[PDB]
Design a protein around this ligand. Structure first.
Ligand code: ZN
Ligand code: ZN
Ligand code: ZN
Ligand code: ZN
Lengths: 15, 115
């Protein structure tokens, strides 16, 4: 499952 | 408010006419609150998630607020639905949840709609 925190960490390419 | 969707993807800088990562045209999805945009594939969304996020006021990771209480507190506890990307605090669920599940978790709205 994703949380905001894990999603931030796995989507590093976001400006 | 003063929101205008950005015409470029935060990840690859391409517009809807050309995703620079894939080399294909691809629509942008844009945050309802801040206007930041991304190609769904750059956001790593499935195709079904892509369709879902276009049906409601999707928010980007930074703006995401809990559907149930409306806050953006406790990033470590704000689950994102794996079918629609809406955010729910684990402590706003009932029964509340102690840890993010392994593998997919989907919200009650999607459970109602799809099953
Ligand atoms: Zn892109
Ligand atoms: Zn946003
Ligand atoms: Zn909440
Ligand atoms: Zn959902």
């Amino acid at each position: 499952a994703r949380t905001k925190q894990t999603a931030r960490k796995s989507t590093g390419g976001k400006a | 408010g003063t929101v205008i969707p950005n015409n470029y993807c935060d990840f690859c800088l391409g517009g809807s006419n050309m995703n620079k990562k894939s080399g294909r045209p691809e629509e942008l999805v844009s945050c309802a609150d801040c206007g930041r945009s991304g190609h769904p594939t750059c956001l790593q969304f499935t195709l079904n998630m892509t369709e879902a996020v276009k049906t409601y006021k999707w928010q980007c990771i930074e703006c995401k607020s809990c559907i149930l209480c409306g806050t953006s507190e406790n990033d470590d506890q704000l689950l994102f639905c794996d079918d629609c990307d809406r955010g729910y605090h684990m402590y706003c669920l009932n029964p509340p949840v102690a840890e993010p599940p392994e593998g997919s978790w989907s919200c009650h709205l999607c459970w109602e709609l799809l099953k």
